[PDB]
Every structure is written in structure tokens, then in C-alpha cells.
């Protein structure tokens, strides 16, 4: 709860610091200010991932 880039970076750090799920998924952020974007994909042995 509060640019767009500064918002997504918060989520990326949270997931990477989560005790679980971080080893199972991969996250990535790119873009500046208003063109910020995030990418989430399957990682490790985990075969399924969803976002909503």
C-alpha cells in the first residue's frame, strides 16, 4: 500500500524473501517510471504457476 517501477520492485523483493514459493518461481522487473513491467514464470521442479 503506497512511479510504477518503485511499486513493482516491492513485490519482487517480497516474493524473493518469502520462505516458500521463491525456490519454485522466477520473477523479473524492467522498464522505467511509467513503462515498468514484471515477468513471472515456472522455476525449479515446480511445474505450475498462476497469477491473479
Amino acid at each position: 500500500t503506497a512511479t510504477a517501477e518503485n511499486v513493482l520492485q516491492q513485490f519482487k523483493t517480497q516474493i524473493e524473501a518469502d520462505p516458500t514459493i521463491k525456490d519454485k518461481v522466477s520473477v523479473n522487473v524492467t522498464g522505467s517510471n511509467g513503462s515498468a513491467t514484471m515477468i513471472i514464470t515456472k522455476a525449479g521442479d515446480n511445474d505450475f504457476v498462476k497469477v491473479t
Partner: protein, 45 residues
């Protein structure tokens, strides 16, 4: 938009090892062998 990202370069390999083996053996039909003492003999009953 047009965006790009980066990932870690991953490579795979198959390393395996093997040794081989050998054996040997040498001999001959013996006669007399070897004795420190070797002298003419007389054997009575």
C-alpha cells in the same frame, strides 16, 4: 512497448570415468628348489 529481460546461462554435461584392469602370473614346473645346505649324502637303514 518493447521489453527485454535476462536469464542465467545454463549448461549440461555427461562426465563419466572408467579404469580398466590387468592380471599377470608366472611360474614353472619345479625341480630341486633351493637349499642353503647342499652336500653328498649317504642314507643307511
Amino acid at each position: 512497448r518493447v521489453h527485454s529481460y535476462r536469464g542465467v546461462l545454463i549448461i549440461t554435461d555427461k562426465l563419466s570415468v572408467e579404469a580398466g584392469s590387468r592380471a599377470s602370473l608366472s611360474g614353472y614346473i619345479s625341480d630341486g628348489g633351493t637349499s642353503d645346505v647342499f652336500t653328498i649324502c649317504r642314507l643307511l637303514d
